[PDB]
Write an enzyme that holds these catalytic residues in place. Structure first.
Site, PDB file in Angstrom:
ATOM      1  N   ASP A  32       0.851  -1.288  -0.095  1.00  7.77           N
ATOM      2  CA  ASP A  32      -0.081   0.021   0.044  1.00  7.77           C
ATOM      3  C   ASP A  32       0.722   1.312   0.092  1.00  7.77           C
ATOM      4  O   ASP A  32       1.136   1.736   0.876  1.00  7.77           O
ATOM      5  CB  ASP A  32      -0.853   0.117   1.164  1.00  7.77           C
ATOM      6  CG  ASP A  32      -1.979   1.166   1.204  1.00  7.77           C
ATOM      7  OD1 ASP A  32      -2.081   1.792   0.362  1.00  7.77           O
ATOM      8  OD2 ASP A  32      -2.658   1.360   2.151  1.00  7.77           O
TER       9      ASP A  32
ATOM     10  N   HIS B 125       7.296   3.930   6.569  1.00  5.71           N
ATOM     11  CA  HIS B 125       7.603   3.727   5.172  1.00  5.71           C
ATOM     12  C   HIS B 125       8.669   4.675   4.876  1.00  5.71           C
ATOM     13  O   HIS B 125       8.839   5.683   5.411  1.00  5.71           O
ATOM     14  CB  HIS B 125       6.132   4.086   4.294  1.00  5.71           C
ATOM     15  CG  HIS B 125       5.447   2.809   3.819  1.00  5.71           C
ATOM     16  ND1 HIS B 125       6.123   1.889   2.842  1.00  5.71           N
ATOM     17  CD2 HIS B 125       4.421   2.377   4.163  1.00  5.71           C
ATOM     18  CE1 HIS B 125       5.138   1.034   2.850  1.00  5.71           C
ATOM     19  NE2 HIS B 125       4.254   1.102   3.492  1.00  5.71           N
TER      20      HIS B 125
ATOM     21  N   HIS C  35       6.826  -2.118   4.295  1.00  8.80           N
ATOM     22  CA  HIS C  35       6.895  -3.393   4.322  1.00  8.80           C
ATOM     23  C   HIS C  35       7.991  -4.253   3.452  1.00  8.80           C
ATOM     24  O   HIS C  35       7.850  -4.769   2.531  1.00  8.80           O
ATOM     25  CB  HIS C  35       5.554  -4.036   3.885  1.00  8.80           C
ATOM     26  CG  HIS C  35       4.376  -3.641   4.644  1.00  8.80           C
ATOM     27  ND1 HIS C  35       3.985  -3.675   5.798  1.00  8.80           N
ATOM     28  CD2 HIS C  35       3.429  -2.560   4.061  1.00  8.80           C
ATOM     29  CE1 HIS C  35       3.053  -3.101   6.302  1.00  8.80           C
ATOM     30  NE2 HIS C  35       2.362  -2.414   4.830  1.00  8.80           N
TER      31      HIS C  35
ATOM     32  N   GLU D 216       4.644  -8.830  -0.626  1.00 10.22           N
ATOM     33  CA  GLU D 216       3.112  -8.753  -0.632  1.00 10.22           C
ATOM     34  C   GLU D 216       2.257  -8.914  -1.588  1.00 10.22           C
ATOM     35  O   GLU D 216       2.603  -8.437  -2.840  1.00 10.22           O
ATOM     36  CB  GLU D 216       3.160  -7.071  -0.030  1.00 10.22           C
ATOM     37  CG  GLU D 216       1.720  -6.649  -0.150  1.00 10.22           C
ATOM     38  CD  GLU D 216       1.592  -5.746   1.047  1.00 10.22           C
ATOM     39  OE1 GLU D 216       2.320  -5.500   1.537  1.00 10.22           O
ATOM     40  OE2 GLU D 216       0.237  -5.189   0.999  1.00 10.22           O
TER      41      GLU D 216
ATOM     42  N   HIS E  57      -1.201  -8.592  -1.468  1.00 12.86           N
ATOM     43  CA  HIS E  57      -2.578  -8.014  -1.348  1.00 12.86           C
ATOM     44  C   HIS E  57      -3.564  -8.224  -2.390  1.00 12.86           C
ATOM     45  O   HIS E  57      -4.842  -8.585  -2.191  1.00 12.86           O
ATOM     46  CB  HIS E  57      -2.458  -6.544  -0.783  1.00 12.86           C
ATOM     47  CG  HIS E  57      -3.498  -6.263   0.001  1.00 12.86           C
ATOM     48  ND1 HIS E  57      -3.315  -5.223   0.892  1.00 12.86           N
ATOM     49  CD2 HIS E  57      -4.765  -6.727   0.338  1.00 12.86           C
ATOM     50  CE1 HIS E  57      -4.418  -5.063   1.507  1.00 12.86           C
ATOM     51  NE2 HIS E  57      -5.320  -5.847   1.337  1.00 12.86           N
TER      52      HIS E  57
ATOM     53  N   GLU F 105       0.447  -8.906   4.370  1.00 12.39           N
ATOM     54  CA  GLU F 105      -0.839  -9.036   3.563  1.00 12.39           C
ATOM     55  C   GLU F 105      -0.705  -9.838   2.410  1.00 12.39           C
ATOM     56  O   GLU F 105      -0.850  -9.446   0.999  1.00 12.39           O
ATOM     57  CB  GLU F 105      -1.324  -7.725   3.079  1.00 12.39           C
ATOM     58  CG  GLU F 105      -1.983  -7.013   4.280  1.00 12.39           C
ATOM     59  CD  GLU F 105      -2.556  -5.734   3.949  1.00 12.39           C
ATOM     60  OE1 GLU F 105      -1.603  -4.645   3.423  1.00 12.39           O
ATOM     61  OE2 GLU F 105      -3.685  -5.514   4.130  1.00 12.39           O
TER      62      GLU F 105
ATOM     63  N   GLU G  34       0.080  -3.493  13.174  1.00 14.22           N
ATOM     64  CA  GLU G  34      -0.574  -2.274  12.801  1.00 14.22           C
ATOM     65  C   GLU G  34      -1.796  -2.097  13.549  1.00 14.22           C
ATOM     66  O   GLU G  34      -2.575  -2.979  14.003  1.00 14.22           O
ATOM     67  CB  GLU G  34      -0.986  -2.065  11.353  1.00 14.22           C
ATOM     68  CG  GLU G  34       0.307  -2.226  10.418  1.00 14.22           C
ATOM     69  CD  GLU G  34      -0.270  -2.709   8.907  1.00 14.22           C
ATOM     70  OE1 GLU G  34       0.430  -3.311   8.341  1.00 14.22           O
ATOM     71  OE2 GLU G  34      -1.358  -2.181   8.618  1.00 14.22           O
TER      72      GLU G  34
ATOM     73  N   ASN H 176      -6.711   4.975  -8.919  1.00 10.81           N
ATOM     74  CA  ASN H 176      -5.994   5.441  -7.873  1.00 10.81           C
ATOM     75  C   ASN H 176      -6.696   5.278  -6.368  1.00 10.81           C
ATOM     76  O   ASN H 176      -8.110   5.377  -6.703  1.00 10.81           O
ATOM     77  CB  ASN H 176      -5.391   6.661  -7.864  1.00 10.81           C
ATOM     78  CG  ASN H 176      -6.733   7.829  -7.901  1.00 10.81           C
ATOM     79  OD1 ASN H 176      -6.587   8.345  -6.756  1.00 10.81           O
ATOM     80  ND2 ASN H 176      -7.137   8.220  -9.109  1.00 10.81           N
TER      81      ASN H 176
ATOM     82  N   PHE I 131      -5.700   7.808   0.324  1.00 11.34           N
ATOM     83  CA  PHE I 131      -5.434   6.650   1.165  1.00 11.34           C
ATOM     84  C   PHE I 131      -3.889   6.448   1.428  1.00 11.34           C
ATOM     85  O   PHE I 131      -3.422   5.639   2.214  1.00 11.34           O
ATOM     86  CB  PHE I 131      -6.073   5.373   0.743  1.00 11.34           C
ATOM     87  CG  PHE I 131      -7.279   5.058   1.436  1.00 11.34           C
ATOM     88  CD1 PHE I 131      -8.553   5.620   1.262  1.00 11.34           C
ATOM     89  CD2 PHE I 131      -7.241   4.168   2.416  1.00 11.34           C
ATOM     90  CE1 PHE I 131      -9.396   5.297   1.905  1.00 11.34           C
ATOM     91  CE2 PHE I 131      -8.219   3.767   3.327  1.00 11.34           C
ATOM     92  CZ  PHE I 131      -9.296   4.264   2.980  1.00 11.34           C
TER      93      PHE I 131
ATOM     94  N   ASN J 233      -1.310   8.398   5.844  1.00  8.97           N
ATOM     95  CA  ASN J 233      -2.188   7.898   6.948  1.00  8.97           C
ATOM     96  C   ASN J 233      -0.892   8.195   8.274  1.00  8.97           C
ATOM     97  O   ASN J 233      -1.206   7.422   9.356  1.00  8.97           O
ATOM     98  CB  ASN J 233      -2.219   6.545   7.153  1.00  8.97           C
ATOM     99  CG  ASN J 233      -3.065   6.237   5.644  1.00  8.97           C
ATOM    100  OD1 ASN J 233      -2.559   5.172   4.923  1.00  8.97           O
ATOM    101  ND2 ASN J 233      -3.930   6.879   5.412  1.00  8.97           N
TER     102      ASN J 233
END
Ligand SMILES: [Mg+2]
Ligand SMILES: [Mg+2]
Ligand code: NA
Ligand code: NA
Lengths: 1011, 210
Positions: A189, A345, A379, A404, A406, A449, A525, A585, A589, A592
């Site tokens: 993400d 990140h 991650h 990952e 996801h 994930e 998380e 997109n 998001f 955060n």
């Protein structure tokens, strides 16, 4: 051969992975960690051209520089030079789900460099090239000739250049493919970039060399005695005269040393490892490494001859520490940890995913300044310096594999596929080989994930078998699989169960005691800090502290992933998803953080800092009990400041030094309390202060605080009876009141106070109307957009009930004359499609003193969604410099995010009362306020409020802060009641039942007066 | 001082409205020089014959949280029936009201008093919007109990059999009430969300002869 489309090929001719080398040739330089001649950075001005597909790359680039190529900086993401778009996508892949294929339009970066090399590097030795991070796959040429191939964007690729090097000018050529079969394991993400984004270098080794070394430290029962075991491995020609010496330094003092010939113990029927040796050093009473005290030793590994000639030396930092899980607890040095952590990140608003020392140090200080002790490499494995900074400043690190998936359906489609185990195993194993010597790495993570598959099981066991000194964790497939030693869910709420099929997220308290369960819980998380958020944070920390097997979590997350864009007048602004023409997109998001991209904090940070304190306080009469939560250190840099004040007015204060042992209690007795003259509330405050600067904080750093209500003296004396009387002047259209130069005008059709006057200066623009709505927060919206509506969302509930457009429908507007005052009595009802949502009943009262006592009583239909706020708003004409308020602050607080705030008199400039979230919403609320001065005005009572140049309209209509414009005068919202901001996650309603406005009937009184 | 605190009139005024009469009172409860409570009420009497009572209470933060915020009086009447639209039919309190249901309830007077052997506060019913007793009717959102025994008699009596029905009827109407506890019966057991800690309290009642 299309290797970027084949998961059976992850590298070609890539040398083995290993801890960080330097090939020092002088032991003192090794010991001191100074530069080594044998390691050249090739970071600088490189040549670069961009291509739409690898097939479009001309064959003349392998021999000569393309004239059309630009000279660019390396390390970098070619997106940050604007050769193509950065793509933000959360779950859905940036490509078609078509394993193993990627698109035939594959952005391709052609990097190259003309370099010069020492005569002795051409004379002897191994010369390798080390690309620390290339995103995502690349082919390598040296001097026209093909060298090798590389995958995995977040670990270093190394190739031998010895057979390729020539006299004079050499030429590298690095072909960087943005998409590869590797992209399918890199679905985090985050922003989707590419390029050579980390360090590129040259390392020159002796032929007979150290190729690996392992540093292990075990302990006895009290950590009073420790062994350091060092396994050393070599390549090249063994000779009876070679020796290895492992020495251990503490400051400028050798503490112990081990010297021996290559020749390891018998392993199996066939013998032992002749090309290895294992040194054991006994160390008495070692200084242990903790985040509380990052005690470091220095280890130097010399390859040398028995006659005393050094061949080369490698080295590392050593922190003596043991991490085990015993009787259901994560223990560090035999003490149970409390993980006060955050996900981080690798991000910069100018440079993309390129990292630097100044940024890291900034991040590490801030975190430790704001009471954090742990961090998750979310991650992927980080830029190598990160672990060193973590070893030295002291943070607990979760090192996470670069896997990952996801976007797979179901999430395990790849991780349960044995065809994908090789590609996966490289990503896990090579992190360990690289990172196993860093004391700061306490936990290995198997990725993120990607569901749960047999591959995860296979690699967990590999790590357990290869590194027994560290627990392995992984959230995938239910957060309690056979693949994790720690129950490590994401966003598992404190008290509320969420019984999702296959993957339920239990309430953390309930999770622990599920039958047959024993493992500890630490959320990988939690507390999504997206926009105005972190509401309900204190609830986690109360539970963390009560339940011994609850041992904390990592917040999602540190920094906002906004990227700087510039406008027409060349002005920067923070941009999110789709702001680059990228699509699909996931919009805002990517943002955060607890801090903005530039590392300015959101106001949620102070909440976190408060909740994550290391000292706990109780009050019992005049006795403060101070409790340390530290596991190891005494309070050798702390003094308690205490302060009593009667409604903002200092009454007495003092200092007492904290001499608290780890996990002990200090009883500080306050002097005979000075009993006050007037009427108000006494509030005790205590700030813990560090007098001395550290490596991580300035002298004066406030690390902890707490307030308490003491004695209250309720005001009883009657208003000093004034000799003025307010005169009612009733017309057809407006009930009008005078009193000296003061004039009030109540409209009869609307039914609201429409204008005030001080002489000929009108005080309003928009009348004092009710408000039952707010510009929605990210937590209010969640996943809902115009095309796919989430009917469950808080906002979509208020939209579909009429809350946002319902209009006042006056039921009564009267004006009786009182003896010493004037009394206006209004009633309103708000409707939508024949439904009564809110009835509002008010009683204004104006006495001869000028004071206007507003009394409000609201009814709420029990079956409408519970409203966002219950209060009043008006647009004031005057624009001011200051805001002055008795109540919680100084920073923005909400019903479920106000523990960090303190009751006091606060004076800030008007713009500090506005919080510039990149996605604009409801902001700058300050709760539990009793008095509020702005200009000549003053509002007394018990309320919450916000005061800005932005309407709730402008905020809910604008999607980017930079596009807001100050409005004429000042909007004031005054709230009797506000709903929680929520944020246990940001994709489902998360505002807790006790912070939803559900009573049905609400009362609150205001007093307005010109001072 | 909660049991021996004496109301001291701060304010008592009346006003002639266009279609009503308005009583405004303010009170302060003290003990050893320290204000325990304050109660600012409006009593509104209009042409319908309905009296609108509004109570705004202030509890001193540092005083222990009171057991109730409400109103009491001794009624001249003694009637046969109690009728109410609130939680019932049986005794219920803020922390013990789940068995109770909201509906129309009609019971004899004696069924509004629980014959607990050691006498104490009893028989309350919560979340009542309407209450009738002879000619009277009260409306709003309140908890109530009703009997021939004062709160004074109850605490001063060691056994139920020693209780004598007083003259008239005793009414205790509260806007708010403290829950009862019972986790144990040898230390405070009333949970925090059932203690009356708010600092400012508001309830409102309409008194009229039906
Ligand atoms: Mg491949
Ligand atoms: Mg993901
Ligand atoms: Na705990
Ligand atoms: Na995100």
């Amino acid at each position: 051969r299309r290797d970027w489309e084949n998961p059976g090929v992850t590298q070609l001719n890539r040398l083995a992975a290993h801890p960080p080398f330097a090939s020092w040739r002088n032991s003192e330089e090794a010991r001191t960690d100074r530069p080594s001649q044998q390691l050249r950075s090739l970071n600088g001005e490189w040549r670069f051209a961009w291509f739409p597909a690898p097939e479009a790359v001309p064959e003349s680039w392998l021999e000569c520089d393309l004239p059309e190529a630009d000279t660019v900086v390396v390390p970098s993401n070619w997106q940050m030079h604007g050769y193509d778009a950065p793509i933000y996508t959360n779950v859905t892949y940036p490509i078609t789900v078509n394993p193993p294929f990627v698109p035939t339009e594959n952005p391709t970066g052609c990097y190259s460099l003309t370099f010069n090399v020492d005569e002795s590097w051409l004379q002897e030795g191994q010369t390798r090239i080390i690309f620390d991070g290339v995103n995502s796959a690349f082919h390598l040429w040296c001097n026209g000739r093909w060298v090798g191939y590389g995958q995995d964007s977040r670990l270093p690729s190394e190739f031998d250049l010895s057979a390729f090097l020539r006299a004079g000018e050499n030429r590298l050529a690095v072909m960087v493919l943005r998409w590869s079969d590797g992209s399918y394991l890199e679905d985090q993400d985050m922003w989707r970039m590419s390029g050579i984004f980390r360090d590129v270098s040259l390392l020159h080794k002796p032929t007979t060399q150290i190729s690996d070394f392992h540093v292990a430290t075990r302990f006895n029962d009290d950590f009073s005695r420790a062994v350091l075991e060092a396994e050393v491995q070599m390549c090249g020609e063994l000779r009876d005269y070679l020796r290895v010496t492992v020495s251990l330094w503490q400051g400028e003092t050798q503490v112990a040393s081990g010297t021996a010939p290559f020749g390891g113990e018998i392993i199996d029927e066939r013998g032992g490892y002749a090309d290895r040796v294992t040194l054991r050093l006994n160390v008495e009473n070692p200084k242990l490494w903790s985040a509380e005290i990052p005690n470091l030793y220095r280890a130097v590994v010399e390859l040398h001859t028995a006659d005393g000639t050094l061949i080369e030396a490698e080295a590392c930092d050593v922190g003596f520490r043991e991490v085990r899980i015993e009787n259901g607890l994560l223990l560090l040095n035999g003490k149970p940890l409390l993980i006060r952590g955050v996900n981080r990140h690798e991000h910069h608003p100018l440079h993309g995913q390129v990292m630097d020392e100044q940024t890291m140090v900034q991040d590490i200080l801030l975190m430790k300044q704001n009471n954090f002790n742990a961090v998750r490499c979310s991650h992927y494995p980080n830029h190598p310096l990160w672990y060193t900074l973590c070893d030295r400043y002291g943070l607990y690190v979760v090192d996470e594999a670069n896997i990952e998936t996801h976007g797979m359906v179901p999430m395990n489609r790849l991780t349960d596929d044995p065809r994908w185990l090789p590609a996966m195993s490289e990503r896990v194993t090579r992190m360990v080989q690289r990172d196993r010597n860093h004391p700061s790495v306490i936990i290995w993570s198997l990725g993120d994930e990607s569901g749960h598959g047999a591959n995860h099981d296979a690699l967990y066991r590999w790590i357990k078998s290869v590194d027994p000194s560290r627990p392995v964790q992984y959230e995938g497939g239910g957060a309690d699989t056979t693949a994790t030693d720690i129950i490590c869910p994401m966003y598992a709420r404190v008290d509320e169960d969420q019984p999702f099929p296959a993957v339920p997220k239990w309430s953390i308290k309930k999770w622990l005691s599920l039958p047959g369960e024993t493992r500890p819980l630490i959320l990988c998380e939690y507390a999504h800090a997206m926009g105005n958020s972190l509401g309900g944070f204190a609830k986690y920390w109360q539970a963390f502290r009560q339940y011994p097997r609850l041992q904390g979590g990592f917040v999602w997350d540190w920094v906002d992933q906004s990227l700087i864009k510039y406008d027409e007048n060349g002005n920067p602004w923070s941009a999110y998803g789709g702001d680059f023409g990228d699509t699909p997109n996931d919009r805002q998001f990517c943002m955060n953080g607890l801090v903005f991209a530039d590392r300015t904090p959101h106001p949620a940070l102070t909440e976190a800092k408060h909740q994550q304190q290391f000292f706990q306080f109780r009050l019992s009469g005049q006795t403060i009990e101070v409790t340390s939560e530290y596991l190891f250190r005494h309070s050798d840099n702390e003094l308690l400041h205490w302060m009593v004040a009667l409604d903002g007015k200092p009454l007495a204060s003092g200092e007492v030094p904290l001499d608290v042992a780890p996990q002990g209690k200090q009883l500080i007795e306050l002097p005979e309390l000075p009993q006050p003259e007037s009427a108000g509330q006494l509030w005790l405050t205590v700030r813990v202060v560090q007098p001395n600067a550290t490596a991580w904080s300035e002298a004066g750093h406030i690390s902890a605080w707490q307030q308490w209500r003491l004695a209250e003296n309720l005001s009883v004396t009657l208003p000093a009876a004034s000799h003025a009387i307010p005169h009612l002047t009733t017309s057809e259209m407006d009930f009008c009141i005078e009193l000296g130069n003061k004039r009030w005008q109540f409209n009869r059709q609307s039914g609201f106070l429409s204008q005030m006057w001080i002489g000929d200066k009108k005080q309003l623009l928009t009348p004092l109307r009710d408000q039952f709505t707010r510009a929605p927060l990210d937590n209010d919206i969640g996943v809902s957009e115009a095309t796919r509506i989430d009917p469950n969302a808080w906002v979509e509930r208020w939209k579909a009930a009429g809350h946002y457009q319902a209009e006042a429908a006056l039921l009564q507007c009267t004006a009786d004359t009182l003896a010493d005052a004037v009394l206006i009595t209004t009633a309103h009802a708000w409707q939508h499609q024949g439904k009564t949502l809110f009835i509002s009943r008010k009683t204004y009262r104006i006495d001869g003193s000028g004071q206007m006592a507003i009394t409000v009583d609201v009814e709420v239909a029990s079956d409408t969604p519970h409203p966002a706020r219950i209060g009043l708003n008006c647009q004031l004409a005057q624009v001011a410099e200051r805001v002055n308020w008795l109540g919680l602050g100084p920073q923005e607080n909400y019903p479920d995010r106000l523990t960090a705030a303190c009751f006091d008199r606060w004076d800030l400039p008007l713009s500090d009362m506005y919080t510039p979230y990149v996605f604009p919403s409801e902001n700058g609320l300050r709760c539990g306020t009793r008095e509020l001065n702005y200009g000549p005005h003053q509002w007394r009572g018990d309320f919450q409020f916000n005061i800005s140049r932005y309407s709730q309209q402008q905020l809910m209509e604008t999607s980017h802060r930079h596009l807001l414009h100050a409005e004429e005068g000042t909007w004031l919202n005054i709230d009797g009641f506000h709903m929680g901001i929520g944020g246990d996650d940001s994709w489902s309603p998360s505002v807790s039942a006790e912070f939803q406005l559900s009573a049905g009937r609400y009362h609150y009184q205001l007093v307005w007066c010109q001072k």
